[PDB]
Amino acid sequence: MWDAQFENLLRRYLPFLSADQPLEQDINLRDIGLDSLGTVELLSELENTYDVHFQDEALTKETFETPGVLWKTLSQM
Amino acid sequence: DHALHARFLRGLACAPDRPAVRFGGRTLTYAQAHRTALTWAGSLLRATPEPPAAVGVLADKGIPAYLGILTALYAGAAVVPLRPDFPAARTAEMMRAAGVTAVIADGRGRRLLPELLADRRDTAVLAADAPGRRVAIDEGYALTAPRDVVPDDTAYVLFTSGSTGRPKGVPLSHGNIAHYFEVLDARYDFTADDVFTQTFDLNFCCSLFDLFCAWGAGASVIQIPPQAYRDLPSHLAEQGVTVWFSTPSSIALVRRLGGLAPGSLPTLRWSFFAGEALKCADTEDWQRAAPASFVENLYGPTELTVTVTAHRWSPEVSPVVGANGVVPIGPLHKGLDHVLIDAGGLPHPDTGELCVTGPQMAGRYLDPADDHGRFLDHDGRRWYRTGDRVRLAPGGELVYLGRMDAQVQIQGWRVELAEVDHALQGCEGVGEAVTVGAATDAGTELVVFYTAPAPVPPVRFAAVLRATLPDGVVPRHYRHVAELPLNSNRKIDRRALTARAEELLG
Ligand code: NA
């Protein structure tokens, strides 16, 4: 269960998800609007807000597929 | 010699043990790529009853895709880049239209094949890492040399937006592309020491520049991955990148995330932009970041083989030649000719729709029906009609003024508003839906106006649209209204609604 900061932040990049509808552990972020521009901005925001650096090793094709993987990747730093 | 794959051979002869591709931390030399392309194309030609006219490359950007592109050319077939992330329906229509009889597919590509080949069960399938016919890959089946081709052989099939939702297919001949690279080979000074970005997705014409300016020269194309965009100086420096090509959008992105601090990009020698209006203020930040770099604006539609103009950025010239803080597109490629058609269909000396003829012109779509209104007959020659209004200066510098019609550019994505409208008829809970392009600081954004008893969740629009439209063209703005306005002749008023879109966004 991620923190409010994480979810509030992630939601600013998911325009096919209303405020009144919850964010599921493994909804496809692509399906709720995350484009390749938002992915870069999102990466930047997470690094700045959590004071962490995503190494090129930990940035698989899967990292930004679902909220659950992103949060797992992030909290493991 | 006119063969696209000959450019890769020129590189191979020049720089056999140098990298041709760096991607995902892996290196592929010209020698490694050559030996694999010979094996794959040999194995493929072994498995097909006839040399296939069109080979699908259904893979994410990366080494499997680059090997797939070379394999198709080496087999003497047309390359048909396919996007595994596109909706299956769109991909199926592209494979159908292009008469694809063989697919080179990565992991993700192969998961889509059960659906895509459902009743194209014939299709040969080569794995780059029970419908379709699995190609057995063996060095024993290798071509010893690549197949030759004639100038009129289709080298590439690329799709542009269609008004009925169905995309228009553009066959580019080896001859079309050879005329393009003769102009670029003469204009630029690339060597096997150069490291080129590969930012363009392989279904887009500008990816030919990345791959075949690099490969023709013995250079390498490199992955610019999503995370590089938040520390571009470190990425360009670590990887020794010397040639940048992207859309203008990337300038604002890189500036926002890591700055474009002056002198921060010293490795760059060439900086190329195409696909959207390039702003003078953006170009100046990029020039000051990359002070050792020449900066050029490149323009052209798929139908004229990648680009047909080039303007060198100069702080002293470009704003003088250019209008409204937009960098000019530059003079027409040597060996092409233009006529400007005004809105009445009459030639004009200096202002009208840019129409182009010469060896870079495709001259047709796959489907003859798409040809109507897109070609001109004038002075005993066939010209392609860009839909782009331009002004000509003495000495031949062109300035982009806007579109004659109701096609729009969303980041780089050229899309017909009719394409989005057609897909929206499918939608539920919606009375009528109309798409407009809203002029924003960012260029143009799709906005849907729609009638209904109540607002409709964006996700419901998205669910329907993603069945037939690539995400690039799926709007993010949905406005519920009581009444859609009608014009003089009782069709919905898109002029009024474009204005209402603009005042909602800025
Ligand atoms: Na001017």
From TrEMBL, chain A:
PROSITE patterns: CARRIER, PHOSPHOPANTETHEINE. Residues 1-77 form the Carrier domain. Pfam families: PP-binding. The keyword Phosphoprotein applies. The keyword Phosphoprotein applies. Gene3D superfamilies: ACP-like. Keywords: Phosphopantetheine, Phosphoprotein. SUPFAM superfamilies: ACP-like. (R)-4'-phosphopantetheine binds at residue 36. This is Acyl-carrier-protein.
From TrEMBL, chain B:
This is Non-ribosomal peptide synthetase. Keywords: ATP-binding, Ligase, Nucleotide-binding. It comes from Streptomyces halstedii. InterPro entries: AMP-bd_C_sf, AMP-binding_CS, AMP-dep_synth/lig_dom, ANL_N_sf, DltA-like. Residues 14-366 form the AMP-dependent synthetase/ligase domain. It comes from the Bacteria. GO terms for cellular component: cytoplasm. One of its GO terms (biological process) is amino acid activation for nonribosomal peptide biosynthetic process. Pfam families: AMP-binding. GO terms for molecular function: ATP binding; ligase activity; phosphopantetheine binding.
